[PDB]
């Protein structure tokens, strides 16, 4: 069952990253829809972008809540802090979309991409660490 917990942790992480990138795919494609005049579809993509990032944040919190050992807990709290940066950048992108402003969009698009780069690396390190811990249990 500690074996079971490692898998549940890996799954939180994998879903969190996937939904976080989906959230960015929705704000940028939503912005394009908006500029094409499809305001209702853009508004649903904004809401979807909100909901995806909020679900990722919640899984990251669960991931911290379940990280006991010192190796894991420190990487996990840095993922949590990095995600906050990412979430704030995407919220910035959603408001540029509501305000129809390319200028504000480009201003935070780069912030989002740099936090997202750190999130991917943190995920890889956590995946390796969790898989190491599961394998040491088996040994």
Specify the stretch interacting with its own copies by CB under 8 A; choose among 64-72, 74-82, 116-124: 116-124
Is 23 annotated to bind ligand?
yes
By C-beta, is 11 or 65 nearer to its own copies? 11
Check binding of 109 to its own copies (CB under 8 A).
yes
Is 57 annotated to bind ligand?
no
Check binding of 75 to Na ion (CB under 5 A).
no
Question: What is the C-alpha separation between 66 and 104, in angstroms, rounded?
Answer: 37
Check binding of 36 to Na ion (CB under 5 A).
yes
CA angle 78, 55, 102 (to 5 degrees): 85
CB 60 within 8 A of CB 84: no
Q: For the chain, what is the total number of helices (H) and then of strands (E)?
A: 4, 0
Question: What is the C-alpha separation between 79 and 52, in angstroms, rounded?
Answer: 17
Which one of 28, 66, 80, 114 is in contact with its own copies (CB under 8 A)?
Answer: 28
The 8-class DSSP code of residue 69 comes to: S
Check binding of 2 to its own copies (CB under 8 A).
no
Q: Which residues are annotated as a binding site for benzoate?
A: 22, 26
Chain residues binding Na ion by CB under 5 A are 33, 36, 102, 106
């Amino acid at each position: 069952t500690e074996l079971d917990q490692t898998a549940h942790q890996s799954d939180r992480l994998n879903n969190a990253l996937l939904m976080a990138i989906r959230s960015s795919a929705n704000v940028s494609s939503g912005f394009i829809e908006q500029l094409g005049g499809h305001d209702e579809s853009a508004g649903k993509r904004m809401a979807l972008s909100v909901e995806l990032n909020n679900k990722s944040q919640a899984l990251v919190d669960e991931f911290v809540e379940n990280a006991r050992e010192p190796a894991l807990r420190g990487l996990a709290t840095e993922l949590q802090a990095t995600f906050a940066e990412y979430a704030k950048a995407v919220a910035g992108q959603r408001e540029a979309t509501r305000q129809r402003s390319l200028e504000q969009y480009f201003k935070v698009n780069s912030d989002a991409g740099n936090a997202m780069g750190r999130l991917q690396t943190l995920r890889q390190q956590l995946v390796t660490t969790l898989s190491e811990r599961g394998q040491q249990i088996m040994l």
